[PDB]
């Protein structure tokens, strides 16, 4: 009843296996993986965005110098100039000709746009993956269970209880350093907090949008106003966050192999088809029925009808059933050569019922198990010319 | 599927060909040539009369 089985990690591929429960009628299983969310553990480092040089009003003493003070503003650049003669609309501003001094100061403050648009640095750990599994086994034909991958957690939705994982591959598309920009994910190597070079990425680094303190290395340097005019000419490197926005690499959600996609989320990488899962499930004995009730289908034979050497269910075959009583009968092929989309067939008195399947061998010689009745369906297949189908469901490529 | 086939250039004959695309039932096709006009390119030279 406790059917342990390793399962390939695919999303849209069934796992219709058969339970070889002694003393009772065998019961088919069926497992599907809707999602394979990874959700690695993450730790935010800092957020960067365009900055705004909030330059306050200059201090202009008409006759006399004025020493500046080292204010605690981030990247607070202050410098005093000498020998200035500012004009304004109302005429010349002072009667002195050399004692005029200007005290110009400027500091970098994060732009108002940071509230909505801002990159996010992230350092990630291994984390723990989760999956949504649908199991339509036996006669219940339904399940809607969210499960983990750790090799301890039971999942007991409906009547059956089972345990999943751990994954065979520790492959994580995320790197140790991950940069998230609004909706797309880039595995860019942000240097560290409080060390960004001016002009490059992370010129302005804030711990959090709420955090008041930040790290603004913009190489801001004021210069003398020209021709006696009241303003604050400041020379600084162009916004580093503006750069790398128009020349960033391909997002990780567009270069991650194994068909894995990401989202603005706990950063799960869903549908990351890789490795296998050691699935173990405990079927309740209630679903089991006495073996003495299943009709006998011995002395039957299998005939191939038309097999296509393709990926979709192009293979069909007719089975000449030789039964005694009437009832349901699970069908399954223990061999991985062929996969049968058909799940249950009712048996009449010496009837014949076609079924569909798919295979990957030119001359498929696969065992067919029919409610405790073995038969080999040997035949021939033909490759298709119009290779236009859904994604392959045979998942059995090997030597042919 | 793309049933490529050479058939004789005749008028009164069905070209009963089967389409054996795997996965589906074969279907027959009938082809007949009612007309075989050639219509070569021409260029008027001149006109003569009594």
Residue A104 CA to residue A270 CA, distance in Å, equals 54
Beta pairing, strands B17-19 & B27-29: antiparallel
Which candidate in A312, A316, A384, A390 is best for mutational testing of the B interface (most B CBs within 10 A)?
A384
Task: Find the helix or strand (DSSP H, E) in which A301 lies.
Answer: strand A301-308
Residue A195 CB burial class (10 angstroms; 0-12, 13-18, ≥19): exposed
Using an 8 Å CB-CB cutoff, list chain A residues near B22.
Answer: 306-308, 310, 314, 382, 384
- Could you tell me which residues come within 8 angstroms of residue A83 by beta carbon, excluding any fewer than 6 positions away? A98, A100
Give me the total of CB pairs closer than 8 Å, taking one residue from chain A and one from chain B.
18
Sign for the CA dihedral angle at A379, A384, A389, A393 comes to: positive
| Residue appearing with tokens 């399947």 | A357
Q: Give the chain B residue whose CA is nearest to the CA of A305.
A: B23
Cα dist from A126 to A95, A154, A174, whole Å: 71, 21, 9
Window 163-222 of A: residues touching B by CB (8 A cutoff) are: none
Longest dimension (CA), chain B: 72
| Option in B1, B2, B22 nearest A382 (CB) | B22
Which positions in chain A touch B3 (Cβ < 8 Å)? none
For this PDB entry, the determination method is cryo-EM
Q: Is B1 on the interface with A (CB under 8 A)?
A: yes
Contacts of A191-194 with C-beta under 8 Å, sequence gap 24+, read A192/A45, A193/A45, A193/A46
Q: Which of B1, B2, B22 comes nearest A306 by C-beta?
A: B22
Q: How far apart are CA A101 and CA B41, in angstroms?
A: 96
Phi-psi category of residue A176: left, alpha or beta, with phi > 0 → left and psi -120 to 50 → alpha: alpha
Q: What is the DSSP string of A86-103?
A: -EETTEES-S-SS--EEE
- Among A358, A382, A389, most B C-beta atoms within 10 A, so best to mutate, is A382
Three-state SS across A328-373? Answer: EEEEECCCCCEEECCCEEEECCCCEEEEEEEECCCCCEEEEEECCC
CB < 8 Å to B1, chain A:
385-386
* B46 part of contact set with chain A, CB < 8 Å: no
User: Is A356 at the interface with chain B, CB within 8 A?
Assistant: no
- Cα–Cα dist A317/A272, whole Å: 35
- Decide the pairing of beta strands A374-378 and A365-370: antiparallel
Resolution reached, in Å? 4.6
């Amino acid at each position: 009843y406790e059917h342990t089985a390793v399962m390939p990690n695919k999303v849209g591929i069934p796992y219709k296996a058969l339970v070889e429960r002694p003393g009772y009628a065998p019961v088919h299983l069926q497992i599907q993986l809707v999602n394979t969310r990874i959700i690695p553990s993450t730790n935010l480092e800092y957020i960067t965005c365009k900055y705004k040089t909030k330059v306050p009003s200059p201090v202009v003493k008409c006759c006399g110098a004025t020493q500046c003070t080292s204010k605690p503003h981030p990247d607070y650049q202050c410098q005093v100039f000498t020998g200035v003669y500012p004009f304004m609309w109302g005429g010349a501003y002072c009667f002195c000709d050399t004692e005029n001094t200007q005290m110009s100061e400027a500091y970098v403050e994060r732009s108002e746009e940071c509230s909505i648009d801002h990159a996010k640095a992230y350092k990630v750990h291994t984390g723990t993956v989760q999956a949504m599994v649908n199991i339509t086994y036996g006669s219940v034909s339904w399940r809607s269970a969210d499960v983990y991958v750790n090799g301890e957690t039971p999942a007991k939705i409906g009547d059956a209880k089972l345990i999943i994982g751990p994954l065979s591959s520790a492959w994580s598309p995320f790197d140790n350093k991950v940069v998230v920009y609004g909706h797309e994910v880039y595995n860019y190597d942000f240097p560290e907090y409080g060390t960004g070079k001016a002009g490059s990425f992370g010129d302005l680094q804030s711990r959090t949008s709420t955090s008041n303190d930040l790290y603004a290395n913009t190489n801001l340097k004021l210069q003398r106003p020209q021709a006696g005019i009241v303003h604050t000419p400041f020379t600084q490197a162009p916004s580093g966050f503006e750069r790398w926005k128009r020349d960033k690499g391909a997002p990780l959600n567009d270069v991650a192999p194994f068909g894995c996609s990401i989202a603005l989320e706990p950063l799960r990488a869903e549908n990351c088809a890789v490795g296998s899962i050691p699935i173990s499930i405990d079927i309740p004995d209630a679903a089991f029925t006495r073996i003495s009730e299943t009709p006998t289908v011995s002395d039957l034979e299998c005939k191939i009808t038309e097999c296509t050497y393709a990926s979709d269910f192009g293979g069909i075959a007719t089975v000449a059933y030789k039964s005694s009583k009437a009832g349901n009968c699970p069908i399954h092929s223990p061999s991985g050569v062929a996969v049968i989309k058909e799940n249950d067939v009712t048996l009449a008195e010496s009837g014949s019922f076609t079924f569909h399947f798919s295979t990957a061998n030119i001359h498929p010689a696969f065992k067919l198990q029919v409610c405790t009745s073995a038969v080999t369906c040997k035949g021939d297949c033909k490759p298709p010319k119009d290779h236009i189908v859904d994604y392959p469901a045979q998942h059995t490529e090997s030597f042919t």
